[PDB]
Amino acid sequence: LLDQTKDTRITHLLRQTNAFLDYYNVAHRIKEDIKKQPSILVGGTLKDYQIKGLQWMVSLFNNHLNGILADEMGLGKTIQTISLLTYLYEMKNIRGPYLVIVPLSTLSNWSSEFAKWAPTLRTISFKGSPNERKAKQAKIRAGEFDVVLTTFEYIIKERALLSKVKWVHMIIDEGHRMKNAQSKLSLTLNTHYHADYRLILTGTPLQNNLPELWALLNFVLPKIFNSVKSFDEWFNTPFDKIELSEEETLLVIRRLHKVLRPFLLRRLKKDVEKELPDKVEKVVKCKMSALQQIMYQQMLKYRRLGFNNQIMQLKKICNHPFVFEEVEDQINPTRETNDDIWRVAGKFELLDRILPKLKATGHRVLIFFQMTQIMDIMEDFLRYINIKYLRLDGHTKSDERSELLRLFNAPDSEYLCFILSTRAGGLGLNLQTADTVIIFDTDWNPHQDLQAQDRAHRIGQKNEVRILRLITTNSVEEVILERAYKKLDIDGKVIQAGKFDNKSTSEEQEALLRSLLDAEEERRKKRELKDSEINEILARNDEEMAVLTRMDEDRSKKEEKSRLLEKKREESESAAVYNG
Amino acid sequence: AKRHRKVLRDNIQGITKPAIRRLARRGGVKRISGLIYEETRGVLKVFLENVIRDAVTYTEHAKRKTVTAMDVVYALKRQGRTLYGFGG
Amino acid sequence: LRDNIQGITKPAIRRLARRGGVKRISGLIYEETRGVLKVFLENVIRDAVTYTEHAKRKTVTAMDVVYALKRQGRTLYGFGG
Amino acid sequence: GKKRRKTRKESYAIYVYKVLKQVHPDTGISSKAMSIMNSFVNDVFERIAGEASRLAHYNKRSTITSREIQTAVRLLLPGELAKHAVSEGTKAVTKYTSAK
Amino acid sequence: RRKTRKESYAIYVYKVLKQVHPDTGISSKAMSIMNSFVNDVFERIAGEASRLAHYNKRSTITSREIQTAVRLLLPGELAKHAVSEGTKAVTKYTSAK
Amino acid sequence: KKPHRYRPGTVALREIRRYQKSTELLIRKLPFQRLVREIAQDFKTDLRFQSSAVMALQEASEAYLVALFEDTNLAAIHAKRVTIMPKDIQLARRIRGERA
Amino acid sequence: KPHRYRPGTVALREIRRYQKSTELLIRKLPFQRLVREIAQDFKTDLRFQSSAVMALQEASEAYLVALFEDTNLAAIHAKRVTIMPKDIQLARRIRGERA
Amino acid sequence: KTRAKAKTRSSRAGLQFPVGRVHRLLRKGNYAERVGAGAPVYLAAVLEYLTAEILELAGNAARDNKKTRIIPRHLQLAVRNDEELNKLLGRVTIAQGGVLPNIQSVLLPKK
Amino acid sequence: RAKAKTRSSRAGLQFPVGRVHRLLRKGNYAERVGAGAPVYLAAVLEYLTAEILELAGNAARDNKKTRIIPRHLQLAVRNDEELNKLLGRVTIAQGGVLPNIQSVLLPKKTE
DNA sequence: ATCTGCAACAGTCCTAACATTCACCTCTTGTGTGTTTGTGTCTGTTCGCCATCCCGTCTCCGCTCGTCACTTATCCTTCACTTTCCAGAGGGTCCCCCCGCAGACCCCGGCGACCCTCAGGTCGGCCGACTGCGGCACAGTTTTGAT
DNA sequence: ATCAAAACTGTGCCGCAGTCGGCCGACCTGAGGGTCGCCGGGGTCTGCGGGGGGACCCTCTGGAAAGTGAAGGATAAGTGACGAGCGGAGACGGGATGGCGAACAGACACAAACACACAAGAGGTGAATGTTAGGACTGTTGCAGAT
Ligand SMILES: Nc1ncnc2c1ncn2[C@@H]1O[C@H](COP(=O)(O)OP(=O)(O)O)[C@@H](O)[C@H]1O
């Protein structure tokens, strides 16, 4: 039991923030309770839970802690943040110096909200040329400013500018880049200057790794270093199925809730707006083929059991063959692609089974990816069979990026399968007009979930979202899936923690904690190719059922040749044991 | 469809015309013909081939896969091209 | 032994140039090649007499000339070792 | 000559004569060319063993083995000479090790 | 991890520098260069004295072989002054203690 | 103010003075690294490198190309010209020994 | 008889015969007096084995033949046929021996 | 009882390089079978002479450039301006060194 | 006891592996000298000697001679490109040069 | 198209430079058995590099183009080079002398290798930390390109 | 033979990596003190071969004279490289995400050194034994230079 010891830490050094200009104690020792907004907030009303979060953060200011707003996508962090800014401007009369930090893909939107909702506060931006930066440099060295927008990058690139000013209150956004304790931006913010009041803002909990520590337990509070430098793994000791994780460390999980009481706020999207209907998630099992089978399972033997770090290449053997392009010089060296040469990957056979019926039934489709060469060769097929599409990646040059949404959100947008990348876009897609979001390869994260779903899960998703998370039989893609999904739904505990770390229904912290521990104890239950089932898990209603059976009749009266290619022969011996 | 990797600027021609001109104007040259570029690029290619095959041989003898500073310095030392600075 | 460098006769230098493949020679090659030959012999003979003075002998030998040529860079096969 | 022990100095001369009678059954060699082949064999010996000495001190071994001589071959000899020399050396060391 | 001592002539180059220019410092990479220079000339003089030992059919590297190695490696005036420095120090070493 | 263009040669001479006055690296690091890794891929297919290995190769190759252009400048000036051509890069390497 | 060859014919036939032959080309006794003078600069009472003098002669003549090959290349490069002191200096500078 | 474990062999000859380290490197470097007791003193004094000559000539190059810290450019200038150091380091490329301010006479236009 | 097996006869070579082993042993190359290393080295040397003598004997065949002279070794060496690269800094005594004339120096074909 | 002059072949001819035995001396290399230390094998830690993508921020590389200083082809003159011949002279060869001297033994002390302590000179992270120094900023020569 | 237009060059200030001085940790290497194989060095002898002198002979150098043919200077048509401007664009920071390989510490059987025994392989001689390249001595065609 060390929660009271950290309470003693904060009780001892809770006086620094008020001299230098129990946890139920530290969040409730001072109170001021005004549900009314500050007077100069213009351009729309507040929701009541927005006022709740605002009042909580005003108490965070008055408890003089370092708070965290961490609710879900599409629930208004921006208006709450500028409401905090204007309440702290007028109703406390300290008038800055305020700093903010956003990603550059949202700085126009944040400056728009700074114009519409606080015209009394003058807002300096930082973008563009060194000419514009030099003009605003000469403007800011005198001290005539209220709000200083800047990105991630100009913190280090204007070190001297934003260090010679004694800062008061920064509020930085998108904290899952602020996570890394050896990020150079994090080192410059820590050895920057003693800026007083700092807030992370995020839409996600801990991801990718171990619990929350390296962002919120470390950067947001410096005294937790002095109280954590040996006990970090001691709290992280929960990190095999019933006895350790479920039975005896349920108290440890409750102690993690108990230490993360006064600092977070993750109100779920299901509570108040709930305009997202649902998320109909299924999984679909692809397989190998005549090269990806014992042909390439020979190459696991005659390579290891050559290319370096084959775990990366074992993704490529189950995504698509001849992305190496050396075996294209043996299977189709005539450099002309056709039927049953591109199609030989089993994922791709599943594509040209499933895609013509959603072409018929009219499902608008987003498709995400890693490995942009898979996007390229899918685009090569997508010009081969000639069905309509687009493509977006890390080579859109920001103008076609801001352009392409008008092409895809037309009422006559005949382009249907909008090819994407899982990384590409940076929370700026804003696309409600799809109803089928398939996924090729699972990442090393649930950020693929928590972004690529939310691209279509925005305000205005007026269908049911049918997700087809592909997988292949006994490849590395399954250990990617079970690895990331199981041991990175650690935040099943934290997504349960959201409601009683929010508005706090009192039965959430025991009863529905157990009801989601049900999903954490159906591990072995959940761990353990037919047109009927696969065509129903995409189906929605019965006219779709009649036309999918009609398309089955229409490709059954046509005599399908066969499914795909068989194992031709001498090139199978040639690709493996004659390379070198 | 550009699906091959045939369409990309090749890596030896990535040693640019203005970088060849900066090594020339450091060398002392006042005026440079137009075939110097191909010739100097061929010269650099052959010299790197000699030094990197010696460094690969030293590395493979030491039974590792990481070509190091001392391996390149020993290779230049037996090229006759002795280098100070990196071999302590 | 006064000015023996001119014992390298003019048709001797012309013969070495004909072995070298020179079709036609200037008239100021002669003093220049005598200077070149004298510099090369001063270097080789300085190094070989250093080997001999170390060996406590009073005799230049074939091995001393071979060792001086080898440490200069010009290896010479045919005079023992 | 009255007895003063003409001092023995070794060479490679009978061995070069053996190899010449292998690769040409009917050709003699001169005395001066025998001395050139002798100085050549000493030169190539000293180059290869000097490079194996440097590899021994680099890798902090203290022992010249078949692998250090193989790597000295791959350093000193060019191209196809290095290839056939490595082939001959490995053939002779396996015929040494296996047979007797 | 038992931090491995990799030694060099850094502090000795520094002593000589503070003798001949008392108010000058040396950069880090120039110290690496002076280190590599001392090791280079060490290997050359030691290699030539080993060659002198094998050429005389003699087993011992002595001061005579180092003196002849310095006269075989160094140009001209550097050779004459370096041989003078070495003989100076060897007579001071043999006479005193 | 547009008709102020220097006599051809003058910018070349101030380039000569600035680049001999300074001591940076002139070929840029990323494409020279990709060239080094390509040429190494022609020998051992699965290598790894080091930042100091690539910087050692870059110091060596830039000092080599600067020495080659000093000698080719001497050969071009000897041929009563100013413009260096390929025939005297090939001459500098033929005389120096690197070609034949 | 006016049977005088034009220059070029006798030059090419001396090129042919002196590349086909193999003997030494500097006279043995004046070369020896040269060597003994140069060595008399460095030591007073030396003695020269005849193989030491002939080793010096082989080395010096292979040196001068290789140097005149490089001077022939430089003279052809300068659009000439005649070798000159400026290109003897050129090959001994590009090679390394002088500067 | 040990008499007086002091006066390293560097201190007897008055040198500044380690005679002990030089003797150990000559001994386990396997240059020859055995090493006299005066050869590393002689060699260490020689290496003191060479380091002293280059560092003096580089001190007088980091005075013209108004700079009290020897960077490798200064070692390049000292080495390649002393002609005997240039002939000792003839094949050597001092890294991060740069070349000398040489512009040929026929290049710069004056007439 | 056996009668005798020379180590050269075991490996099938011609060169003296015993003489190679004592030369590697006391030439001060390293301290310990392996037992397969002189076999490998004598193999390398027998190969290089066989190559040189084969090319020299072919040139002596070409000049109707049955005694191999230093001219013949010079012609073999400087006409094989790889042996020329190995013996680049080497003066084979009584060599001469390759019979080579430049192409400018030929007389004018039209006159 | 025909004299003509070196130069490559065609077949003897002393001689000398290798190649066979030969016994033979000796030293040197196998053969074989105690033995010890250098090299490898696996277990754990840490940190830097690899295969993939991202997301900005820029100097800087590529392409166009105008314009002219260069490279090169022609021609003319002229002097420095080759070719030939011919008188002389030192280089080459033989031979004889004739002592300095290189090398081989012989013997006997200094001396360096090896070993065993044991104190302290050297590396080496921290711990500031002082400052020497690059990067902006502002006047002020200082050459170049017209004129 | 004077002024516009850029380009270095001082000064100067201001943060920033980065020398650098202790701090002691904390060793691991050098110094000292003993022992004892062993190698180098002083000393004698003795063939041996390099310096030197001289006789003779002749090929090879020195020198001059005549022709001439490349070296070099002047000239001009031609074009290709250079300076400058502008707009994409790839280097360059920084990030995400695992994963692996190399440097670094103990245990240990191959393996290489030691050291005797001994014979047999390899130098040194010699002596025919040929023999094979070398050296004049002439026959005989292929390149060269006015016809
Ligand atoms: N009281 C309100 N009335 C209308 N719209 C609101 C209100 N509060 C918030 N919003 C909406 O919230 C949006 C901003 O939300 P944002 O901060 O982007 O949420 P998230 O950060 O979760 O994506 C605005 O576009 C605005 O339309």
Centre of ligand 1 from the C-alpha of residue A112, in Å: 13
Strands A147-148 and A123-124: parallel
H or E, element range at H22: helix H19-28
Task: Please say whether the beta carbons of H79 and H46 come within 8 A.
Answer: no
* CA B77 to each of CA A333, D54, E45, H103: distance values in angstroms, whole numbers, following the listed order: 45, 11, 16, 30
Q: Of the candidates A261, A214, A225, A222, which has an alpha carbon nearest to the alpha carbon of residue A20?
A: A222
- Mind giving me the DSSP string for E46-95? HHHHHHHHHHTT--EE-HHHHHHHHHHHS-HHHHHHHHHHHHHHHHHHHH
Which domains are assigned to chain A?
3-259 (3.40.50.10810), 280-488+541-557 (3.40.50.300)
Q: What share of chain B is helix, strand, coil (3-state, %, to 5)?
A: 55, 5, 40
Residues sharing a CB contact under 8 Å with residue A139, sequence separation 6 or more, in sequence order: A124, A145
Burial A61-80 (b: 16+ CB within 10 A, else e): bebbbbbbbbbbbbbebbbb
Chain E 34-73 residues whose Cβ is under 7 Å from strand J:
60, 62
Q: What does the alpha-carbon distance between residue C46 and residue D9 come to, in Å, rounded to a whole number?
A: 28
Residues sharing a CB contact under 8 Å with residue D14, sequence separation 6 or more, in sequence order: none
Task: Please say whether the beta carbons of A71 and A267 come within 8 A.
Answer: yes
* CA I29 to each of CA A267, C71, D66, I19: distance values in angstroms, whole numbers, following the listed order: 77, 19, 14, 15
Count Cβ atoms below 10 Å from residue H92 Cβ, excluding itself. Answer: 20
> G1-99, superfamily in CATH?
Histone, subunit A (1.10.20.10)
Count Cβ atoms below 10 Å from residue C25 Cβ, excluding itself. Answer: 22
Instruction: Say whether the peptide bond before residue A97 is cis (omega within 30 degrees of 0).
Output: yes
Tell me F24's DSSP state: -
F-G Cβ pairs (cutoff 8 Å, strict) = 35
The resolution of the experimental structure, rounded to one decimal in Å, is: 3.5
Q: What does the alpha-carbon distance between residue D85 and residue D72 come to, in Å, rounded to a whole number?
A: 11
Backbone angles phi, psi at A443, to 5 degrees: -80, -165
How crowded is the C-beta side of G70, counted as CA atoms within 13 Å?
28
For the record, the structure tokens of A365 come out as 């489709």
How crowded is the C-beta side of I22, counted as CA atoms within 13 Å?
4
CA-nearest residue, atom 9 of ligand 1: A76
Residues sharing a CB contact under 8 Å with residue B47, sequence separation 6 or more, in sequence order: F61, F64
Which domains are assigned to chain H?
1-111 (1.10.20.10)
Q: From the candidates E57, E60, E61, E71, which should be mutated to test the interface with C, based on the most C CB atoms within 10 A?
A: E71
Q: What Å value separates CA G80 and C1' J75?
A: 18
> Residue A98 pairs with which residues in a beta bridge?
A147, A169
Q: Where are the beta strands (DSSP E) in D1-100?
A: 28-29, 63-64
Task: Tell me, letter by letter, the H, E, C secondary structure of A483-528.
Answer: HHHHHCCCCHHHHHHCCCCCCCCCCHHHHHHHHHHCCCCCHHHHHC
* CA A553 to each of CA A362, A534, C5: distance values in angstroms, whole numbers, following the listed order: 19, 16, 109
Class of domain D1-100: mainly alpha
From the CA of E42, how many Å to the nearest CA of chain I? 18
Q: What does the alpha-carbon distance between residue A204 and residue A186 come to, in Å, rounded to a whole number?
A: 19
Q: Which residue of E has its CA nearest to H67?
A: E24
Q: Of the candidates H43, A262, H16, D48, which has an alpha carbon nearest to the alpha carbon of residue E65?
A: H43
Q: Which residue has the tokens 């020993």?
A: B74
Q: What does the alpha-carbon distance between residue B37 and residue B18 come to, in Å, rounded to a whole number?
A: 10
| C1'-nearest nucleotide to the CA of I111 | K145
Centre of ligand 1 from the C-alpha of residue A76, in Å: 4
The separation between CA D12 and the C-alpha centre of its own chain, rounded to angstroms, equals 10
The sign one gets for the Cα dihedral A102, A105, A108, A109 is negative
Task: Please say whether the beta carbons of F38 and B8 come within 8 A.
Answer: no
Q: What does the alpha-carbon distance between residue A171 and residue A450 come to, in Å, rounded to a whole number?
A: 23
CATH number of B1-88: 1.10.20.10
> Residue I52 pairs with which residues in a beta bridge?
none
Centre of ligand 1 from the C-alpha of residue A496, in Å: 24
Q: What does the alpha-carbon distance between residue H7 and residue E92 come to, in Å, rounded to a whole number?
A: 14
Count Cβ atoms below 10 Å from residue H111 Cβ, excluding itself. Answer: 2
Backbone angles phi, psi at F60, to 5 degrees: -65, -45
Tell me A231's DSSP state: T
- Mind giving me the DSSP string for A136-180? HHHHHTTT--SEE---SHHHHHTTTHHHHS---EEEE--TTTT--
The sign one gets for the Cα dihedral I85, I88, I94, I95 is positive
Q: Characterise A128 by phi-psi region: left (phi > 0), alpha (psi -120 to 50), beta (else).
A: left
Q: Where are the beta strands (DSSP E) in G24-98?
A: 82-83
Long-range contacts, G38-47 (Cβ 8 Å, 24+): G38/C38, G38/C41, G38/C42, G38/C45, G39/C45, G39/C49, G39/C60, G40/C1, G41/C42, G42/C45, G42/C46, G42/C49, G43/C49, G43/C52, G43/C53, G45/C58, G46/C49, G46/C52, G46/C58, G46/C59, G46/C60, G47/C58, G47/C59, G47/C60
> Residue I32 pairs with which residues in a beta bridge?
D63
Chains E and G touch (3+ CB pairs under 8 A): no
Q: What does the alpha-carbon distance between residue I58 and residue E61 come to, in Å, rounded to a whole number?
A: 47
- D17 Cβ contacts chain J strand, under 7 Å: yes
Q: Where are the alpha helices (DSSP H) in A180-335?
A: 184-190, 213-216, 223-226, 232-235, 250-259, 294-303, 310-319, 328-331
The residue count of chain D comes to 100
Strands A365-368 and A436-439: parallel
Residues sharing a CB contact under 8 Å with residue H81, sequence separation 6 or more, in sequence order: H57, H61, H100
Q: Determination technique for this PDB entry? A: cryo-EM
- Opening angle at CA B52, ends B51 and B57, nearest 5: 100
Q: CATH second-level architecture of E1-97?
A: Orthogonal Bundle (1.10)
- Mind giving me the DSSP string for H32-83? SSEE-SSHHHHHHHHHHHHHHHHHHHHHTTTTTTS-SEE-HHHHHHHHHHSH
CA-nearest residue, atom 25 of ligand 1: A76
Task: Please say whether the beta carbons of D76 and I45 come within 8 A.
Answer: no
The sign one gets for the Cα dihedral F33, F35, F39, F42 is positive
> Residue A471 pairs with which residues in a beta bridge?
A285
- Mind giving me the DSSP string for A192-224? T---SEEEEE-S--S-SSSSTHHHHTTTS-SHH
Q: Which residue has the tokens 């089974």?
A: A353
Taking the alpha carbons at both ends of chain D, their separation in whole angstroms is 46
For the record, the structure tokens of H12 come out as 């007897």
Task: Please say whether the beta carbons of E44 and H47 come within 8 A.
Answer: no
CB contact under 8 A, E56 and C54: yes
Tell me I94's DSSP state: T
Residue of F71, F78, F88 with shortest CB distance to G87? F78
CB contact under 8 A, B61 and D59: yes
Q: Of the candidates D9, D35, G42, which has an alpha carbon nearest to the alpha carbon of residue C52?
A: G42
Q: Given the CA of residue A81, which atom of ligand 1 is nearest to it?
A: 17
Q: Of the candidates A580, I32, F57, D72, which has an alpha carbon nearest to the alpha carbon of residue B61?
A: D72
Class of domain C1-81: mainly alpha
When the candidates are 1.10.150.120, 1.10.20.10, 2.30.42.10, 2.60.120.10, the CATH number that belongs to F1-100 is 1.10.20.10
The separation between CA A402 and the C-alpha centre of its own chain, rounded to angstroms, equals 20
Q: What does the alpha-carbon distance between residue B70 and residue B88 come to, in Å, rounded to a whole number?
A: 9
Task: Please say whether the beta carbons of B36 and F84 come within 8 A.
Answer: yes
- List the domain boundaries for chain F: 1-100
The sign one gets for the Cα dihedral A299, A300, A306, A311 is positive
Long-range contacts, F18-21 (Cβ 8 Å, 24+): F19/B22, F19/B25, F19/B26, F20/B26, F20/B28, F20/H98, F20/H99, F20/H100, F20/H101, F20/H102, F20/H103, F21/H101
Chains A and F touch (3+ CB pairs under 8 A): yes
Using a CB-CB cut-off of 8 Å, the residues of chain G touching I94 are 22, 58
Burial H38-67 (b: 16+ CB within 10 A, else e): bbbbbbbbbbbbbbbbbbbbbbbbbeeeee
- List the domain boundaries for chain D: 1-100
Residue with CA nearest to J26's C1' atom: D8
Q: Which residue has the tokens 């250090």?
A: D68
Q: What does the alpha-carbon distance between residue A502 and residue C28 come to, in Å, rounded to a whole number?
A: 101
Q: Of the candidates A175, A135, A176, A170, which has an alpha carbon nearest to the alpha carbon of residue A155?
A: A170
Task: Please say whether the beta carbons of A113 and A78 come within 8 A.
Answer: yes
Angle between helices G85-94 and G50-77 (to 10 degrees): 110
Q: What Å value separates CA B29 and C1' K2?
A: 34
Letter for the amino acid at A220? V
* CA A232 to each of CA A2, A8, A226, A254: distance values in angstroms, whole numbers, following the listed order: 11, 17, 11, 16
- I61 Cβ contacts chain J strand, under 7 Å: no
Residue of I90, I93, I101 with shortest CB distance to C79? I93
Q: What does the alpha-carbon distance between residue G43 and residue C52 come to, in Å, rounded to a whole number?
A: 10
Q: What does the alpha-carbon distance between residue A126 and residue A140 come to, in Å, rounded to a whole number?
A: 11
- List the domain boundaries for chain B: 1-88
Residues sharing a CB contact under 8 Å with residue B30, sequence separation 6 or more, in sequence order: F9, F12, F13, F16, F82, H107
**Binding site as annotated, residues of A for ATP:** 71-78
Task: Please say whether the beta carbons of A476 and A495 come within 8 A.
Answer: no
For the record, the structure tokens of G39 come out as 């060595």
Chains C and E touch (3+ CB pairs under 8 A): yes
Chain A 197-216 residues whose Cβ is under 7 Å from strand K:
207-209
Q: What does the alpha-carbon distance between residue A263 and residue A70 come to, in Å, rounded to a whole number?
A: 10
Q: Which residue has the tokens 């649930």?
A: A446
- Mind giving me the DSSP string for A375-387? HHHHHHHHHHTT-
Q: What does the alpha-carbon distance between residue A158 and residue A155 come to, in Å, rounded to a whole number?
A: 5
Q: From the candidates I24, I28, I29, which should be mutated to test the interface with E, based on the most E CB atoms within 10 A?
A: I28
Task: Please say whether the beta carbons of A151 and A102 come within 8 A.
Answer: yes
From the CA of H99, how many Å to the nearest CA of chain E? 16
Q: What does the alpha-carbon distance between residue F53 and residue B51 come to, in Å, rounded to a whole number?
A: 12
Letter for the amino acid at C52? T
Residue with CA nearest to K98's C1' atom: A444
Q: 3-state DSSP call for residue I21? A: helix
Q: What does the alpha-carbon distance between residue B23 and residue F24 come to, in Å, rounded to a whole number?
A: 11
The sign one gets for the Cα dihedral I1, I2, I8, I14 is positive
Angle between helices F86-96 and B36-61 (to 10 degrees): 40
